[PDB]
Amino acid sequence: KVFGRCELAAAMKRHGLDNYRGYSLGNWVCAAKFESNFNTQATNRNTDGSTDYGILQINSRWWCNDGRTPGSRNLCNIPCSALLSSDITASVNCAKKIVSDGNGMNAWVAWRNRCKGTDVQAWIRGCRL
Ligand SMILES: [Cl-]
Numbered sequence: 165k166v167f168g169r170c171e172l173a174a175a176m177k178r179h180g181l182d183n184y185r186g187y188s189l190g191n192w193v194c195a196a197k198f199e200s201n202f203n204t205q206a207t208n209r210n211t212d213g214s215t216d217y218g219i220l221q222i223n224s225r226w227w228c229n230d231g232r233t234p235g236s237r238n239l240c241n242i243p244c245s246a247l248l249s250s251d252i253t254a255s256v257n258c259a260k261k262i263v264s265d266g267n268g269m270n271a272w273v274a275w276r277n278r279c280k281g282t283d284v285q286a287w288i289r290g291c292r293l
């Protein structure tokens with residue numbers, strides 16, 4: 165599924181990300197925009213052989229099982245495929261674990277490089293929330 169901007173902001177709010185670990189809703193929408201262009205089916209192979217999955221590009225190196233990332237962990241206790249669903253539950257629940265683990269949203273490279281320090285409220289501007 166390719167979410168619209170305000171559509172995703174509303175879904176993310178319903179799924180409990182607004183101000184989760186102190187990160188306002190616009191931080192999460194901005195992260196999704198630059199990680200996946202709001203496409204739940206986005207996958208990208210990293211040069212180490214791990215793959216990033218879903219709207220927040222969660223990496224099989226640590227967070228999910230795809231059966232083809234030797235030596236990796238599955239800290240969210242899910243198949244990576246769960247992260248590709250139209251239903252954002254598994255991505256959201258895993259992201260909540262990630263953002264809680266010490267480094268905050270810096271875990272998302274696109275967030276650090278393209279969202280951090282910017283006017284992230286523009287991403288939810290005008291949305292019915
Ligand atoms: Cl694996």
Ligand SMILES: [Cl-]
Pocket residue numbers: 185186267268269
């Ligand atoms: Cl933080």
Ligand code: NA
Pocket residue numbers: 224225226227228229230231233236237238
């Ligand atoms: Na893994």
